[PDB]
Design goal:
Strand content of chain A: 35-45%
Keywords: lectin, crosslink, hematopoietic progenitor, sugar complex
Strand order of the largest sheet of chain A: 2-5
Number of strands of chain B: 8
Entry title: Structure of FRIL, a legume lectin that delays hematopoietic progenitor maturation
Assembly: octameric
Number of helices of chain A: 0
CATH architecture of chain B: Sandwich
Oligomer: heterooctamer
Helix content of chain A: under 10%
Largest sheet of chain A: 2 strands, antiparallel
Radius of gyration of chain A: 16 Å
Distance between the termini of chain A: 36 Å
CATH topology of chain B: Immunoglobulin-like
Order of helices and strands of chain B: EEEEEEEE
PDB class: lectin
Number of domains of chain A: 1
Chains A, C, F, H: mannose binding lectin, fril
Shape of chain A: globular
Bound molecules: alpha-D-mannopyranose, calcium ion, manganese (II) ion
Structural class of chain B: mainly beta
Order of helices and strands of chain A: EEEEEEEE
Radius of gyration of chain B: 15 Å
């Protein structure tokens, strides 16, 4: 009935086929989902999200098999010596989903229920 | 808040449920991970993670390695279509708070199939 | 750098991953890019267009090979005995493109330059 | 108006350039086809068309058959990136006027690749 | 005899282990199915079956439908690489004995991926 | 490290890219894994197997994920009114594997251990 | 000797037809290239080449770059099925003689499709 | 009717799914289509060929579109300072094809017609 497949190997500055929420951006061909110090150092209280433009069908009444595979290459680094926070996540949410609170929330949830 | 996420958690929040160690988690509608496994993070290097789902094996699985070391694996049984709606968008999300870390993504590849009757 | 691939084999009524312009719609699992008589007969002066949700990168400064392949199954039929009009087209246009005049224009162009 | 389209034309418009017969055409920025080939339309049956492009062979090609009969082929040399911008959306379009015809689409499949340096 | 097979069994052989009904089975090194599920065979019509494996979810799964009716599902947990060697060939097999049946295959599609470190 | 994907939608008479064992053959674009009566009726005591030419890597020392998906369309039919036998199977076996006993064995195993 | 090959030639053999410079060539049944283009070889670095064919655009094309420099392109019109049989095997070949060079291959990726009626 | 797609990103020592002809071999995860000095230096008068196990359908009577795309990463290097020879080639030949003369022949042809 439906099939969708997409691949990214560099991240163009003007990525018309991605949706950007929060301090998420892209430079030097990578995705900076978290705000950055004009010197290239991580900042505090930042939340960034990226969503693939197109919606995706996950299920349908008369349908019986749905499958998805995704591979991600990400780098969590810190120049500092303090503890590192917070998280990196791959998520699937209703199309109109919007970024939530930061911290140990990963811009995914508002509270802790 | 509706969402299913696989997370690589660097900061522990026991009040939020996070066990006491850098972990990767599968979350269904809450930051309170349903299942969790120890992940050996590594500053500076880059990580590769594969996440797979199958409506029949009703299983969602994650494996993440670091090129050279042993991988980390986590699996949780779900029937995604009971938790999420029929139409979804897929994304990557990262955050910080009092403490920081660089959240960068290098290549990302995703493919999906749905079959009807 | 980038790859996009999608497949449709039925057309769901609520095709969240398609953009609809004009009298284009979908029923009985097919795409009706042209308005229809409540009895199932073709009407006059109709224009319909469908666009894949996601934008597509066609070119880039430091890039050297771009290729696309698409297969289409369409049916042009008429119950009547008069001449049939007008056209069916596969097009690639800037993302914000909007439907144009009908007739032998195929909702693609405004004039005839 | 900017656009590149491959068209299966059922109604002839000599004032618009259409040759005198059901044809399939490749159009660049104008309904005035750059190249055209005779297409043997068939009421009721369904048609399959493949369209392919390659920035290196600087060629765009179309082949359309009807299951059982001989196909129709048309090729035009272009360097798409001189005619269209860097970001595009792909679509199917159909129209009518004083005269009618049913414009229906059954399965549609599209795949694209871009390679950089 | 080394092999892993998913079978759609039409003739019951209780001495061979077959439960008392047309079934689909997952077999590891023996015709004595490890797990089995009721399959509603249908003379004349054609069946579609999907079989999937994942070294991480350590699960092998089958779903088979008949276009119009309800499907049949079977899952068994294995770590294929403990049962089979590093190099394999994939095949379809059918047989008869005192009793007959037509064993015909229409389209068959297979895809495989392996990832290292 | 490795990837293999193949698709069949018709079965040519001379399928150079398949290995044939037993009464397995092909005509009218389909695969007849079981012998047939010159009138088109199923016969008794028949065993047929087909194997994709190329070998397939299932595992490797420093490797961690292996996955395969295959879809099959098959038809089990009988013109007669007697009970139908025996079985249809999809199998993965070492490359040099050879057809075994028929009956409820499915040309897969020799005994019943 | 039957074969169609795309070649990256490092040693010039004027008696064999090779123009006077490192070139890439398309060959049909003979080492005597039908068409040839200047290729800027580079010791030590690795090269990426894409070769594409289409029975409709009756064109075979090659593009080879070196990561950082300008690519090299060659296209030749053929109807492969008049030159080669219905069944073929695809390969990579390298050779030396009085003079040497290391012939090594790193990743190789190939995909093919055929459509009937 | 048919589709075949395969990918290699490393070359295992025992590549059961490749056919080897000549001095072609594999070590350190790469393909050495040309013989080598036990010190890792190129030798003279060497010919090596590799063929994908499975046969490939290029054409068929009632068939109308055949297409193939392949990307290759190869390295031609020499430690010496003399001229480098000879060639690297991607070829498609009948299934039973066997390696030919070396030199500027690229193990592809016997003479120079
Ligand atoms: O810096 C990490 C930490 O910072 C603060 O304490 C809060 O924002 C927490 O939610 C978060 O986990
Ligand atoms: O019906 C087809 C024909 O109708 C009218 O004459 C006009 O709208 C034309 O542009 C169109 O080609
Ligand atoms: O005809 C089916 C049946 O026939 C015989 O009894 C034997 O060959 C059995 O193994 C087989 O199950
Ligand atoms: O070394 C390259 C050169 O060596 C010899 O002269 C012959 O084998 C030639 O065919 C070849 O081109
Ligand atoms: Ca946390
Ligand atoms: Ca017209
Ligand atoms: Ca049985
Ligand atoms: Ca030469
Ligand atoms: Mn957590
Ligand atoms: Mn026209
Ligand atoms: Mn059984
Ligand atoms: Mn030459």
């Amino acid at each position: 009935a439906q099939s969708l497949s997409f691949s990214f190997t560099k991240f163009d500055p003007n990525q018309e086929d991605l949706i950007f929420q929060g301090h998420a951006t892209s430079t030097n061909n990578v995705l900076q989902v978290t705000k950055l110090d004009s010197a290239g150092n991580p900042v505090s209280s930042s939340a960034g999200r990226v969503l693939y433009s197109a919606p995706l069908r996950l299920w349908e009444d008369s349908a019986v098999l749905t499958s998805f595979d995704t591979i991600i290459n990400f780098e969590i680094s810190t120049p500092y010596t303090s503890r590192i926070a917070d998280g990196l996540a791959f998520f699937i949410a209703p199309p109109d989903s919007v970024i939530s609170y930061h911290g140990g929330f990963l811009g995914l949830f508002p509270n802790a229920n | 808040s509706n969402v299913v996420a696989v997370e690589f958690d660097t900061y522990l929040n026991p009040d939020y449920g996070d066990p006491n160690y850098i972990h990767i988690g599968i979350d269904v509608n809450s930051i309170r991970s349903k299942v969790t496994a120890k992940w050996d993070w590594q500053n500076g290097k880059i990580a590769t993670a594969h996440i797979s789902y199958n409506s029949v094996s009703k299983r969602l699985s994650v494996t993440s390695y670091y090129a050279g070391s042993k991988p980390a694996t986590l699996s949780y049984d779900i029937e995604l279509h009971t938790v999420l709606p029929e139409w979804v968008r897929v994304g990557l999300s990262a955050s910080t708070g009092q403490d920081k870390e660089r959240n960068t993504v290098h290549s990302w590849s995703f493919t999906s199939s749905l079959w009807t009757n």
